[PDB]
Amino acid sequence: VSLPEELNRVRLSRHKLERWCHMPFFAKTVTGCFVRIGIKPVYRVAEITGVVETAKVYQLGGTRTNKGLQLRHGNDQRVFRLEFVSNQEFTESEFMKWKEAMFSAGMQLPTLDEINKKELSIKEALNYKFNDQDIEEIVKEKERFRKAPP
Amino acid sequence: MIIPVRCFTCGKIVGNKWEAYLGLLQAEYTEGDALDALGLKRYCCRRMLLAHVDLIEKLLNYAPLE
Amino acid sequence: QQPMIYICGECHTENEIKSRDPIRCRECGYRIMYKKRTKRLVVFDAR
Amino acid sequence: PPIDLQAEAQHASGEVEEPPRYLLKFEQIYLSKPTHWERDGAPSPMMPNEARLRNLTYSAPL
Ligand SMILES: [Zn+2]
Ligand SMILES: [Zn+2]
């Protein structure tokens, strides 16, 4: 990956990740994507490694989630909430900030052709058919963090 | 169900007075006194408020369509 | 160009139920759903 | 009346058998509240309006 435009395909926009905040195998949906996280002119494209748990429930638009996200910027890896991610796309410098983070960690750089099998997973995650026994587990997520009377 | 907009017989608007009438009804006014205060003298007009049933208050009890 | 959006009963929330998808709300899983108002034009004379 | 059933003698023993007999007596009765089970059998409260809209029978299991 040597062009700041192409990483935007595997980038999670905020209008769509809320609609995927309850997609099954979420730990298979977000692991590998990139986000425009908020943390003077420094900002970072973070590596989504895993999904962890925070004890703080925050509202992501209409939905609310205590879920945490295991982000990493080359060497700096920790939990984050879906509150500093923005819907806006990656600028030129922020992608280089990510390259510089990968250069400083010694960690292997993604090849340009590798993205094709990752970007397609999101299309199947969006076009997912809700026919199975997902109802108990989907409804359980909202009742866990939001009161029963609404 | 909700206050008729106009007097069935004569055509006088009676839809803009139900809240006024309810304000009058909070006090011990007899159903006739409220009409007297609102100036509705012909019985055609008076029948409109005297016989009205505000059921819409019951209709609001139902869960809302966000 | 519809994913076939339906309105839940007790949730009142638009849920996407595509063809041959079970009519259940995304939240509460209630089985009752109502079709959303038509997008077709609706006009009355008020008479 | 409580049931008293006696097995039909097969006469396999070659003698007039005294076949085993099974007896049943009904005791306590229970009635749940109105319960709606989704197609999966998951129990949920059956509300009259739910039964009305789903053309269900507003009933409770016994
Ligand atoms: Zn009149
Ligand atoms: Zn629902």
Curated annotation (Swiss-Prot), chain A:
Changing residue 77 to A: Reduced binding to single-stranded DNA. The gene is RTF1. It comes from Homo sapiens. It is found in: Nucleus, Nucleoplasm. Changing residue 53 to K: Reduced binding to single-stranded DNA. Component of the PAF1 complex, which consists of CDC73, PAF1, LEO1, CTR9, RTF1 and SKIC8; the association of RTF1 appears to be less stable than that of other subunits. At least in HeLa cells a N-terminal shorter form of RTF1 is also found in the complex. The PAF1 complex interacts with PHF5A. This is RNA polymerase-associated protein RTF1 homolog. The Plus3 domain mediates single-stranded DNA-binding. Component of the PAF1 complex (PAF1C) which has multiple functions during transcription by RNA polymerase II and is implicated in regulation of development and maintenance of embryonic stem cell pluripotency. PAF1C associates with RNA polymerase II through interaction with POLR2A CTD non-phosphorylated and 'Ser-2'- and 'Ser-5'-phosphorylated forms and is involved in transcriptional elongation, acting both independently and synergistically with TCEA1 and in cooperation with the DSIF complex and HTATSF1. PAF1C is required for transcription of Hox and Wnt target genes. Residues 1-127 form the Plus3 domain. The chain holds residues 353 to 507 of 710 of the full protein. Disulfide bonds: none annotated.
